[PDB]
Design a protein around this ligand. Sequence first.
Ligand SMILES: [Mg+2]
Ligand SMILES: [Mg+2]
Ligand SMILES: [Mg+2]
Ligand SMILES: [Mg+2]
Ligand SMILES: [Mg+2]
Ligand SMILES: [Mg+2]
Ligand SMILES: [Mg+2]
Ligand SMILES: [Mg+2]
Ligand SMILES: [Mg+2]
Ligand SMILES: [Mg+2]
Ligand SMILES: [Mg+2]
Ligand SMILES: [Mg+2]
Ligand SMILES: [Mg+2]
Ligand SMILES: [Mg+2]
Ligand SMILES: [Mg+2]
Ligand SMILES: [Mg+2]
Ligand SMILES: [Mg+2]
Ligand SMILES: [Zn+2]
Lengths: 177, 66, 115, 82
Amino acid sequence: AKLHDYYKDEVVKKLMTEFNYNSVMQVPRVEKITLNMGVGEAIADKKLLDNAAADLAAISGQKPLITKARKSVAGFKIRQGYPIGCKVTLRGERMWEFFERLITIAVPRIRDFRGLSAKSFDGRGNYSMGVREQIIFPEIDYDKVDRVRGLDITITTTAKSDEEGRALLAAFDFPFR
Amino acid sequence: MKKDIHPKYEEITASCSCGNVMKIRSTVGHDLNLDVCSKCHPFFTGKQRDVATGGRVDRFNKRFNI
Amino acid sequence: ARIAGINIPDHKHAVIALTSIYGVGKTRSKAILAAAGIAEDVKISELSEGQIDTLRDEVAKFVVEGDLRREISMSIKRLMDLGCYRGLRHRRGLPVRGQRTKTNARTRKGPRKPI
Amino acid sequence: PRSLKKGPFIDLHLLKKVEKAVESGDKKPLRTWSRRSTIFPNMIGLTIAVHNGRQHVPVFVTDEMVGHKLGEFAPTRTYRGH
RNA sequence: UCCUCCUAAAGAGUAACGGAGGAGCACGAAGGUUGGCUAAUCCUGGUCGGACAUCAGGAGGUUAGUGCAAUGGCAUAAGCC
RNA sequence: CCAGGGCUACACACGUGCUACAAUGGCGCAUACAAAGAGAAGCGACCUCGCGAGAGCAAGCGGACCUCAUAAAGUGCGUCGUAGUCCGGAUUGGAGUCUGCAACUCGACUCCAUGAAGUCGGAAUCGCUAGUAAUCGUGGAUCAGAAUGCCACGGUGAAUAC
RNA sequence: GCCCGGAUAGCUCAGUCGGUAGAGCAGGGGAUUGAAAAUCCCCGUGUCCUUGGUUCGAUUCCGAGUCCGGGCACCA
Ligand SMILES: [Mg+2]
Ligand SMILES: [Mg+2]
Ligand SMILES: [Mg+2]
Ligand SMILES: [Mg+2]
Ligand SMILES: [Mg+2]
Ligand SMILES: [Mg+2]
Ligand SMILES: [Mg+2]
Ligand SMILES: [Mg+2]
Ligand SMILES: [Mg+2]
Ligand SMILES: [Mg+2]
Ligand SMILES: [Mg+2]
Ligand SMILES: [Mg+2]
Ligand SMILES: [Mg+2]
Ligand SMILES: [Mg+2]
Ligand SMILES: [Mg+2]
Ligand SMILES: [Mg+2]
Ligand SMILES: [Mg+2]
Ligand SMILES: [Zn+2]
């Protein structure tokens, strides 16, 4: 809740000053953070997805949801109902703790890290990102790794524009190039 | 949240090399030792180098002089 | 056991372990060990954290994986854009230092491919 | 390569022709046969057609080509594949 | 031998060696009840990942879906757990 | 007659050889035993500097005198502990040295990194009967500089031939 | 005019229950041979006749079309 307190103390002021807001409700807020791992190789082995579920639950303290296929696709040799991905949703105290841990530890640990792009707000203020490695998270021991499987993070916020999303992230001191 | 499907989530301390000791809630159990935190990172500090650094002319004029 | 963003094996000696980084060899490993006052018969394990911190500080004096590859790629792209003979050989996938292409050029030509 | 103490190599027949053009402003394509000479910063901005063996290949000297040998920018043998 | 549309002339029905297609099954759950939910498609952003797997939003509003061929219906859903 | 380029190209196929694929080994330190040859537009001590190719002053030698020139493998003490490995150095980037008016297309070598393919090789085939084969270094001609080639020298040193 | 069958590698054939096409001949290095044969080793070659549809998906299932092979066109 440290980041939530920091927000409510010293982010709404900056955002209201720089956007001429009238009410606190106009200030954008972080609705949720969802982590996704699209393991498109579970057809060969089911344990390849059961280990991904464990690796995703070791990062955030929630048992992941084993998502399935919306429809059958022949280009990937799949049929409807086959589980091919893991999803985790974070809202509230765990969301703030994961955000703080990420920005404070995991982002600097990325190999050859030179910032993050500021053009991934999909025109609605929600920020998308993706990592090519998971062991950057300190919850994984190198000697116990099986394969390397990344993930994609999406921060869904109440902001209405990329400018507002970027301003909120800058107030949160998010890496921007 | 459900009781016995989620992993244990306790508080822990992550001591960094630069001395920026932090306390965060994780699931590792033991204390954490960190090499590069958000304070001792070159990009966060602002000291990020580049590649170009001039070019051919400075090297030529510093090596060969008439 | 994590230096410059990559992991380092623990059962090997320091000189061999430092060579696992892209840009550090035997000479640049022995120099770092001599500067940090660390012997060569010891492994990555059985060591404290201040030694690793000063080893990282001394390694930061050099160019490593993050900037090493960027410089190489920039030089290659500069040669290709300028259009020198060396850049053209790099574009074609042929030796650039001056060799024979009639025979024994497999390293640049790739695997054998008949008609 | 060339020894650093000796310095860069350049022929007078091209050095005079380029040092005249520097102040003359005659940016018409010069012609030369000496592909063994280095490139000096004063040459930048001029067009020089150098003899590759059959004809003169024109090259516009830029900033990134100083320490490179001049002959490096003129193909000698024609090749287009089999 | 049985089922859907047209010919079939706005009640029903109505023929031809007429024009177009199907059936000789399946399910102890694919039935009953209770509780809850709404897509096809396209756009934007994101690691392997590509026109299309998974994830976030936005547009769209049944243009999807019905265990099966067609017709008539289905949002209180007859569709989805 | 002169300048530049080419004789060193390249989807390929062939021969002759080098490095290797590793512990009968690689790497680090220490330490013995040779032979035969060249040197005046030459060999180039000692000393200083550069980690290193090499740069400077400058002796000696037309040579059983001086230089090239420390022989290596070998032995002792340690490490790696069977992995694409502290094997393999290819290729590549940067910084350099030497000769040569002039090292881009094309010389040789040094340093910092990069560390591919390869884990004993199919049909088939080659050389060898003794200081031979195998293995390890050295010198010389060519040459301003440029050999894993050629010509000679020695060190360790086999198995087998009914 | 009617009906049946087939269309697959350069040639001759096999195959397929919807997801992944093989065999022989032939061709390309190579080996042996003075050189060709013969033999041996190393190889890879298809949009499965065209078109439109049910399907996540068709060389496979269905409806039409092209070519070829075959069987009939009888009682007057
Ligand atoms: Mg050469
Ligand atoms: Mg009626
Ligand atoms: Mg009526
Ligand atoms: Mg039902
Ligand atoms: Mg209901
Ligand atoms: Mg996508
Ligand atoms: Mg229907
Ligand atoms: Mg029902
Ligand atoms: Mg020749
Ligand atoms: Mg040893
Ligand atoms: Mg010295
Ligand atoms: Mg020894
Ligand atoms: Mg080695
Ligand atoms: Mg090296
Ligand atoms: Mg004999
Ligand atoms: Mg010579
Ligand atoms: Mg001998
Ligand atoms: Zn720190």
